[PDB]
C-alpha cells in the first residue's frame, strides 16, 4: 500500500490536493429572502458528490473493498460535512458559513450552538489547514471501523489496514507539530486536544441525525462509488 | 495541576468505584421489561458510586457545582458503558453487566448496541488495555464530554482549568506508555488509538440514549448526590 510508505509531508500534500472546493448555495441574490432547509439540502447533496471523490483520494481508502468504503462513508458523511462547516466558519465568530452566500448568525438552535462551540474551540487552538485535513481523514477512516459486521479474514485485514493508515495520520499530525516548533510535551497534548474534539463532532452528528430519503443509503453510496 | 504523572495515576486508582451486583435471583428467562428493570436498578445504584468517584478525580471539585452537574449530565452513560466494556474484556463474546449478570449475544435481542459494546471490548483486548490506562480514559470522558457545551470570565477560567487537567491526564497516559518501554512513535500512536475509541463510546451512548427514549438523572438528583 503506497499509503503506508508516505512521509508526513507526502500525506499532507495528498490530503491538501484532494480537498473539495467550497460550494455556493443556489440562493439568487437578485430575489428576496422570502427555504433554509431547501438551500441546505441542495448544498449538502452537491457536497456529497465531491465527498465521494475526495474519499477515493485519501491515501489507503481505495485499498479497501467497495463494501468497506461504503460502510465508512455511511458512518462518517454527516461528521465530514459538519467539520467542513466548522472549518469554514472559524474566522466568523458567532456565525456558521454554510456557504459564502449562506452565512447565518445564531439569531434548529441546539445543534447550531454546538457547531459554534466547535468553531470557537478550533479558533482558540489556532487549528491549521494541514491539521484540519488530517482530522477529516481520521473521521472517514475511524467512524465506521468499530462497526464492521464480518468475521472473515478479509474483514480483519481491512480493519488492520485502516488502523495502520490511522497510525500514519497520527505520525503526520505529530510531524506537523514538531516542524511548527512544539516541544514533545506540547505535541502529545495537542494531538489529544484535536482527537477529543472528534468525540464532540460524533455527538453533533448523532444529534443532527435524530433532528429529522434523507440519509444516503448503502446502495446509493455504492452506486456513487462505482460511478 | 501540581500532581506528577505518578500521583495522578495513584489518585485515579484509589478513586475507583466498586463493582456492584445485579439484584439477586431474577426470574429467568428475562422479559423485555424485567431485563430493562434489572439494568435500570443496577445503573441507578452505580450512579451513586460514580458521583463519589467523580469528586475524587483531580480537578473536578475545583469546578462550580453547576459545572460538575453539567459534566455528569453529558458523561454518565459513557462512563457506565466504558466500565461495562472494561469488566467484559476477559469474557470474549459476553457482557459482564455484573458478576452475577453475564450475558452472551444469544441472550438479549437490544442486539445492535450489544454488538457495539462487544466490539469495543474486543478492541480493548486486542490493544492489551491496562488498568492504569482505563482510569485515565474514564476521567477524560468525565472532563471532556460536556466541556464544549459550557461568556463570563469565570466560565472561561472553568474551561481553561478543565483543559489544563485534561493536558495533565494526557501527560500521565504518555508517562505510563514511556515507562512500559514504548518508543516515542508507539506512544503517540497508542494515545491516538485510545482517544479515537472514545468517539465510538460517545456514539454508543447516543444510541443507548435514543433506545432508552424509544431516562436521564435529573439536574436536581445529580446536585443532591454531589452535595451529599
Ligand atoms: C430549518 O433549517 C435548519 C437547518 C439546519 C438545521 N440543523 C442544525 C443547524 F442549523 F445547523 F444548526 S441540522 O438539521 O443540524 C443540519 C446541519 C448539519 O446537520 C444537518 C445537515 C444536513 C445534511 C444533509 C441534508 O440534506 C441532504 C439529504 N440528502 C442526502 C443523501 C441523498 C439524498 C438526501 C440536510 C442537512 C448538516 C450539514 C449539511 C451541510 C453542511 O455543509 C454541513 C452540515 C436545522 C434547521
Ligand atoms: C430490555 O433490555 C435491554 C437492555 C439493554 C439495552 N441496551 C443495549 C445493550 F444491551 F446493553 F447492549 S441499552 O438500552 O443500550 C443499555 C446498556 C447500557 O446503556 C443502557 C444501560 C442503561 C443505563 C441506565 C438505565 O437506566 C437509568 C435510569 N435512571 C437513571 C438515573 C435517574 C433515574 C433513571 C438503563 C439502562 C446500560 C448500562 C447500564 C449499566 C452499566 O453498568 C452499563 C451499561 C437494551 C435493551
From Swiss-Prot, chain A:
Annotated NR LBD domain residues: 7-227
Reported impact of residue 94 to V: Destabilizes the receptor and decreases its affinity for estradiol at 25 degrees Celsius, but not at 4 degrees Celsius
Region (Self-association): 1-227
Positions of the UniProt region annotated as Interaction with AKAP13: 1-227
Entry binding sites for 17beta-estradiol: 47, 88, 211
Disease linkage: Estrogen resistance: A disorder characterized by partial or complete resistance to estrogens, in the presence of elevated estrogen serum levels. Clinical features include absence of the pubertal growth spurt, delayed bone maturation, unfused epiphyses, reduced bone mineral density, osteoporosis, continued growth into adulthood and very tall adult stature. Glucose intolerance, hyperinsulinemia and lipid abnormalities may also be present.
Protein name: Estrogen receptor
Gene that produces this protein: ESR1
UniProtKB/Swiss-Prot annotation, chain B:
Outcome (variant: residue 136 to A): Loss of hormone binding capacity and temperature-sensitive loss in DNA-binding
Region (Self-association): 1-228
Stretches assigned to coiled coil: none
Annotated lipid attachment (S-palmitoyl cysteine): 136
Location of the protein in the cell: Nucleus; Golgi apparatus; Cell membrane
Tissue: Widely expressed. Not expressed in the pituitary gland.
Residues where Phosphotyrosine is found: 219
Residue numbers spanned by region Transactivation AF-2: 4-228
Ranges where the record places region Interaction with AKAP13: 1-228
Post-translational events: Phosphorylated by cyclin A/CDK2 and CK1. Phosphorylation probably enhances transcriptional activity. Self-association induces phosphorylation. Phosphorylated by LMTK3 in vitro.
Record note on what altering residue 57 to E does: Has higher transcriptional activity in the absence of wild type ER. Inhibits transcriptional activity when coexpressed with the wild type receptor
Disorder association: Estrogen resistance: A disorder characterized by partial or complete resistance to estrogens, in the presence of elevated estrogen serum levels. Clinical features include absence of the pubertal growth spurt, delayed bone maturation, unfused epiphyses, reduced bone mineral density, osteoporosis, continued growth into adulthood and very tall adult stature. Glucose intolerance, hyperinsulinemia and lipid abnormalities may also be present.
Domain notes from UniProt: Composed of three domains: a modulating N-terminal domain, a DNA-binding domain and a C-terminal ligand-binding domain. The modulating domain, also known as A/B or AF-1 domain has a ligand-independent transactivation function. The C-terminus contains a ligand-dependent transactivation domain, also known as E/F or AF-2 domain which overlaps with the ligand binding domain. AF-1 and AF-2 activate transcription independently and synergistically and act in a promoter- and cell-specific manner. AF-1 seems to provide the major transactivation function in differentiated cells.
Family: Belongs to the nuclear hormone receptor family. NR3 subfamily.
Subunit structure and binding partners: Binds DNA as a homodimer. Can form a heterodimer with ESR2. Interacts with FOXC2, MAP1S, SLC30A9, UBE1C and NCOA3 coactivator. Interacts with PELP1, the interaction is enhanced by 17-beta-estradiol, the interaction increases ESR1 transcriptional activity. Interacts with EP300; the interaction is estrogen-dependent and enhanced by CITED1. Interacts with CITED1; the interaction is estrogen-dependent. Interacts with NCOA5 and NCOA6 coactivators. Interacts with NCOA7; the interaction is a ligand-inducible. Interacts with PHB2, and UBE1C. Interacts with AKAP13. Interacts with CUEDC2.
Record protein name field: Estrogen receptor
Organism of this sequence: Homo sapiens
Amino acid at each position: 500500500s503506497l499509503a503506508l510508505s508516505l512521509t508526513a509531508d507526502q500525506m499532507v500534500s495528498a490530503l491538501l490536493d484532494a480537498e473539495p472546493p467550497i460550494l455556493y448555495s443556489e440562493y439568487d441574490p437578485t430575489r428576496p429572502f422570502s427555504s433554509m432547509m431547501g438551500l441546505l439540502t441542495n448544498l449538502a447533496d452537491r457536497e456529497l458528490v465531491h465527498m465521494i471523490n475526495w474519499a477515493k483520494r485519501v491515501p489507503g481508502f481505495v485499498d479497501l473493498t467497495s463494501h468497506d468504503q461504503v460502510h465508512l462513508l455511511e458512518c462518517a458523511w454527516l461528521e465530514i460535512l459538519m467539520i467542513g462547516l466548522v472549518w469554514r466558519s472559524m474566522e466568523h465568530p458567532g456565525k456558521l458559513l454554510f456557504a459564502p452566500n449562506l452565512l447565518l448568525d445564531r439569531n434548529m438552535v441546539e445543534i447550531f450552538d454546538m457547531l459554534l462551540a466547535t468553531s470557537s474551540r478550533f479558533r482558540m487552538m489556532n487549528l491549521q489547514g494541514e491539521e484540519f485535513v488530517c482530522l477529516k481523514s481520521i473521521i472517514l477512516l475511524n467512524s465506521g471501523v468499530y462497526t464492521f459486521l464480518s468475521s472473515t479474514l478479509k474483514s480483519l485485514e481491512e480493519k488492520d489496514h485502516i488502523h495502520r493508515v490511522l497510525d500514519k495520520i497520527t505520525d503526520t499530525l505529530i510531524h506537523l507539530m514538531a516542524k511548527a516548533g512544539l516541544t514533545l510535551q506540547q505535541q502529545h497534548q495537542r494531538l489529544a486536544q484535536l482527537l477529543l474534539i472528534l468525540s464532540h463532532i460524533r455527538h453533533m452528528s448523532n444529534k443532527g441525525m435524530e433532528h429529522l430519503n434523507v440519509v444516503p443509503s448503502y446502495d446509493l453510496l455504492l452506486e456513487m462509488l462505482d460511478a
